[PDB]
Amino acid sequence: AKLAKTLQRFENKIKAGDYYEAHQTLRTIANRYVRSKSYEHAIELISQGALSFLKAKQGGSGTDLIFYLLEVYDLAEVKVDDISVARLVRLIAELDPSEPNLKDVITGMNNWSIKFSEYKFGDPYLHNTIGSKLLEGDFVYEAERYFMLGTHDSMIKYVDLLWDWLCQVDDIEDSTVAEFFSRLVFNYLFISNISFAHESKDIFLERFIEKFHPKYEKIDKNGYEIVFFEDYSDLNFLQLLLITCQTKDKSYFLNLKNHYLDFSQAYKSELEFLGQEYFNIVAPKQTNFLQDMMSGFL
Amino acid sequence: AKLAKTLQRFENKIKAGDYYEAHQTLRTIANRYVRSKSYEHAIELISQGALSFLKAKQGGSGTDLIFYLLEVYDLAEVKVDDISVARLVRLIAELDPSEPNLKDVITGMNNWSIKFSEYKFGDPYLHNTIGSKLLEGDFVYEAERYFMLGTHDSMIKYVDLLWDWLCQVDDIEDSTVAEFFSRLVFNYLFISNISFAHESKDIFLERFIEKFHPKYEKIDKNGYEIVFFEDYSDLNFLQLLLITCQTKDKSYFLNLKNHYLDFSQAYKSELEFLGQEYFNIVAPKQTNFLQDMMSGFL
Amino acid sequence: TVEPNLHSLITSTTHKWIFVGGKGGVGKTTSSCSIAIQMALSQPNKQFLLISTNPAHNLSDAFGEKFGKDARKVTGMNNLSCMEIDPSAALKDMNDMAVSRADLTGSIPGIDEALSFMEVMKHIKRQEQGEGETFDTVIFDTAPTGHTLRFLQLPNTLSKLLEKFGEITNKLGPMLNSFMGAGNVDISGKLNELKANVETIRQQFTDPDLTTFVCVCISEFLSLYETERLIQELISYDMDVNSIIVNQLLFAENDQEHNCKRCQARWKMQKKYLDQIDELYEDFHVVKMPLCAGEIRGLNNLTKFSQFLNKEYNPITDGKVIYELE
Amino acid sequence: TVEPNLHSLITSTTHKWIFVGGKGGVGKTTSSCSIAIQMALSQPNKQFLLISTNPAHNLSDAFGEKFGKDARKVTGMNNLSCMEIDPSAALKDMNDMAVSRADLTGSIPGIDEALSFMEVMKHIKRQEQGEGETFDTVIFDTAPTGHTLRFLQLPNTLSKLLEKFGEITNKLGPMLNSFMGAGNVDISGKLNELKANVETIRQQFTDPDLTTFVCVCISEFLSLYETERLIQELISYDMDVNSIIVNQLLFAENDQEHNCKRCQARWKMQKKYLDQIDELYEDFHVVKMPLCAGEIRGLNNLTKFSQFLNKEYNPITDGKVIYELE
Amino acid sequence: GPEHEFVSKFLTLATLTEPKLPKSYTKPLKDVTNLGVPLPTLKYKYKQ
Amino acid sequence: GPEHEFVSKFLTLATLTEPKLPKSYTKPLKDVTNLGVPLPTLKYKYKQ
Ligand SMILES: Nc1ncnc2c1ncn2[C@@H]1O[C@H](COP(=O)(O)OP(=O)(O)OP(=O)(O)O)[C@@H](O)[C@H]1O
Ligand SMILES: Nc1ncnc2c1ncn2[C@@H]1O[C@H](COP(=O)(O)OP(=O)(O)OP(=O)(O)O)[C@@H](O)[C@H]1O
Ligand SMILES: [Mg+2]
Ligand SMILES: [Mg+2]
Ligand SMILES: [Zn+2]
């Protein structure tokens, strides 16, 4: 078995224009390659064919071949490296925003990155492209959770997306800016990426000061500078919460919580998770329904 | 729609020799007949075709057409009459003892007889032929339960079958004859057909006295005559049980039960059912597992 | 009357579901694609969907374009989408990945019929809501006789099982209340909603003016009698079937040089079984289709072959189509 | 080497199960009957059974004789029985009728696969016991690709479900003992017996010297790629498939007067896909079968057509068989 | 032995008066509801 | 109002000593196990 004429037929079909017969022939050749335990040839063949079909504006064949490539990745035990990640990054780049199963292929690549790497949620370099591609496809809530665990460029794109989302809203009602800034603070405080949280806060507050015209006062002490607003107390609460989480002390957290009682009530889940993560506060365990019935009745 | 050429093709196929194509054509014609709500034509057509296929020593086609005829019987609401029963009796007569699904067709005919008649178990005239056909197919235990609810000829055939079964056994060990006679007495006492029980007892005991040579004494009083054996006390117990069930009195039953303690223990189910049926003895109800657990534990 | 064409079905403005079934390779996929193409050509104001309920899908091979679990428009056709029901196995995040808002049962036999019924439920729900993509008609490229029969009989089984479950729940009401905790989930309400949805599905599936079955077959003993059994089973379910597509006919008498012993003996057998079919189904739309000089694949080829569903194929005049189709 | 015939399978003395599958009317029933007839002719000392697992059975139509849920010998063949698995619905006495010794689940989709697996279990139990009718080999006339794939994948699903149920039972042992009554039924023992039986079935179904799969197909795009997908799925299940039957070949070049324009363009397409098949499966037993002048029905006709499984069909010399077969 | 005397006495007492149910009583099969417990299978095998 | 004084006092107390965790701390993504509770969806909608 050499697959000489089969590969020649695949090339002739892909050049002539009949792309589905070429896709089926490519799947046949890849089946023979994987069967013969030759994973390198299959990997390059499938990747090149998927790229060629995605360049031809054909979502179905290219996406099916990406799924085949991910199956070969899983079966061949391919680790997360620069070349292996770039192989998927090229396919993401050639993918279409209007792909009906864009989320499926994105999830497949992310799952492969999870399984074959030390990261518990995926390779940050892969996440940087995944989030942008999902944003192009109007998956903003799904694309925010990918910029969260990305690189520095992912943080920049997350800040840009949040700023554009805020600018697209005509009204303000002194609640929009707080609701946008809370996501930026909390998402980057959950993973304890406080450097990224501080930089994103600086960028967002500078953009807010530029586009809008509120009353700001730079309270700077010891090296730490916090902007102060009169009407927009939520921004001050979020900045002070970031500072308190930075210093990791219980007394400051208690003072902030019992001062800003209304906002602590509004964000109860976020503050209790932050206390559990940072201040070693033992949050109550999950209230399982069966256990609750057994304890309360049995 | 006239089905002229379809019927002509069915006749030509059945005459030529191709019986399966004829069977399929007949099924087609019967489908068209039943669809047009013409149940008489379908009934005669299916019955005649099934008879023709059974005469040709073809179990599969004839049996399938018998099942089709029973389906048409159920769907057309055909009552149990002389003609309708004879229609199935002819098919049973032409059936083969070695039919792989003889029990299935027998059960279907019996179920139809149950559903469309006042009898709770089937037409006795149908049962007379059903039991004989099942006996030909070596279904003796299944063919005994059909002679039970048959006609007088069914009782005669049941006695003949029991006598032949006893004669076929080389040994006796003074337990064979009792075990054979117990079935004849109990089966015809359960349905309270005491006339048939008495006649079958007379025939069986006369045959036993003829072929064998035991010590018999005719204790005859008031018109009732019972044969008495010295060694074969089981026959005397069964005859006295029949007499006691005939008179329907509790005192005689108690005397017989506490005299023949061993045989009462051996046939405990039969005596307790007979007492419940005849002497208005309230037998204990079924011991349901769930109810037993609920009463004993909950 | 019963003309030998599907013109009444093609230009019908009321049909919502159109099942195409038959016996194993008589042309179910080709004829379903042909019916869908003809309908979408004759009704440019309605959007049509073509679902492949066969667990080994062949819509992509027939159309020369890959289709998936989700509706995808056919290239060159602006009012015809094609979908092939994937056996679930939807990709899910391995870890939490909390976005701001088992598998063994997927391997159980008969899962594809349940998935097809779930797709039907989703489509009827969408039509009731009128949101997202709206498909005015859905054409099914069904599995062979037995499995499409099981698919069509599934609504009755589901309704009976739902009725039994509701009866058991009503019987055990006090017992389940005393046994279960403080759950506020309305089991009866959801059960009744599911029963109503299944009843609506059954009502649409037994309406002669809303659904229909087209039985494709070839004129041969096995295929003819399989079609007869399938039609009997459909009539048992009370589903309107009144069209039959006799496929792969040689027409070796009224053609140019079809004088090859085999391509003539086969036509003799086919004509015998055609006479039998015409005798059996006198009230059906029996559409006679030819055997072309090659496989019927691609949108242009499928359209050229489908042009004979609207108008009856005349082998005397329309004899060059089967040779311009290789 | 790989000769283009099934002679290695036909004269094999070790094979116990032989599945014949493919794509929807390529000749699964005809080729399964042909394989069974050739095996029973070449091995007169062994009794062979031919089960039809297709829910719409066609064994009776092919053999011209009605077969049922129970094994029935083929007329004229003393060592070949045929069985068509009826979907249960066994007739039962309406009333008690105490001889001296639900239905809704029968309508659930996928019931026929479960019934076929139960028949396989019964046959392996009988072979272990060696009582009643003993069938040394069983040939399956399977359903089309998807449903036969589900049938063959059923043992793995059943084994996984049995393992999960056993794990749950072991976990709840004390709890089920405290909850249930004084039942002495050995749930663990029966579960282990069922697991052992299913494991034996799987071991026999993944043994290259005990079971095999024969993939019948016609040389066309849809059929060829459906066969490719089916072979890939079988290899995934680790089931030995090494025979392919390319069916309904015109052979319009090396014949007498096969100059019919169509019967020649179709042969050009068939030869192209034959070259593709020979390129793909170089290590398979690719048996090329002709298209006869009529349907292959009846024991004599099936035997005459099957004679080409033992010896490769030579269209130059064996050209009169397809015309003596109408 | 004594069993003969017991049988004779039992027969005389039973046949002192005409039994409530006639000697040739035949309950119609239409009114039969229960067939009773199944009889035990014999340790032989009819083979003719 | 008093909120300015509270903010100033809180900042002075927090920045009295260098915090235990550095200003530019970045926990590696390899060691992150939980992402926390999901944030609530916004009442608006991206268009772009
Ligand atoms: N009228 C015709 N003339 C020529 N070739 C045809 C014709 N109809 C169908 N074919 C071809 O025959 C082959 C089998 O037909 P098709 O794929 O439609 O079968 P099917 O009914 O979908 O089968 P399955 O039951 O396996 O799903 C295909 O290659 C198809 O292109
Ligand atoms: N080589 C052949 N030459 C001529 N006719 C053939 C040939 N093989 C099969 N046939 C005929 O073609 C028809 C379809 O074949 P067959 O019944 O074997 O299909 P199948 O694979 O069992 O289909 P299904 O998937 O529906 O079960 C039958 O009438 C059969 O007799
Ligand atoms: Mg199809
Ligand atoms: Mg078949
Ligand atoms: Zn020809």
Residue numbers in the entry:
A (entry chain E), B (entry chain B): 11 to 308
C (entry chain A), D (entry chain D): 4 to 104, 127 to 351
E (entry chain C), F (entry chain F): 7 to 54
Question: Please, what does the article write about this entry?
Answer:
The Guided Entry of Tail-Anchored Proteins (GET) pathway ensures accurate targeting of Tail-Anchored proteins (TAs)—a diverse class of membrane proteins—to the endoplasmic reticulum (ER) membrane. In yeast, newly synthesized TAs are captured by Sgt2 and transferred to Get3 for delivery to the ER, where they undergo subsequent membrane insertion. Efficient and protected handoff of hydrophobic TAs from Sgt2 to Get3 is facilitated by the Get4/5 complex, which is thought to act as a scaffold to position TA-bound Sgt2 and Get3 in proximity while trapping Get3 in an ATP-bound conformation necessary for TA binding. For Get3 to receive the TA, it must adopt a closed, nucleotide-bound conformation, which forms a hydrophobic chamber capable of accommodating the TA's transmembrane domain.
Here, we report the 3.2 Å cryo-EM structure of the Saccharomyces cerevisiae Get3-Get4/5 complex, using full-length Get4/5 containing the Sgt2-binding domain. As previous studies have shown that ATP-bound Get3 exhibits the highest affinity for Get4/5 (22), we utilized the Get3(D57N) variant. Mutation of this residue has been previously shown to effectively trap Get3 in its ATP-bound state by allowing ATP binding without subsequent hydrolysis. The complex adopts a two-fold symmetric arrangement, with a central Get3(D57N) dimer in an ATP-bound closed conformation, flanked by two opposing Get4/5 heterodimer arms extending outward. Each Get3(D57N) monomer engages a Get4/5 heterodimer through three distinct interaction surfaces, mirrored symmetrically on the opposite side of the dimer, resulting in six contact points across the assembly. Key catalytic and nucleotide-coordinating elements in the ATPase domain, including P-loop residues K26, T32, and T33, as well as the catalytic residue D57 (mutated to N in this study), adopt conformations compatible with ATP binding and hydrolysis, indistinguishable from those observed in Get3 alone. Most notably, a region we designate as the lateral gate, which forms part of the wall of the TA-binding chamber and adopts an α-helical conformation in free Get3, undergoes a helix-to-coil transition upon Get4/5 binding. In our structure, this region is unstructured and engaged by Get4/5, creating two lateral openings on opposite sides of the chamber that increase solvent and presumably substrate accessibility. At the same time, the apical surface of the TA-binding chamber, which is typically disordered and unresolved in structures lacking Get4/5, becomes more stable and interacts with a C-terminal α-helix from Get4 to form a composite lid over the chamber. In our cryo-EM structure of the yeast Get3-Get4/5 complex, we identified a consistent density feature adjacent to the lateral gate of Get3, extending from the last modeled C-terminal residue of Get5.
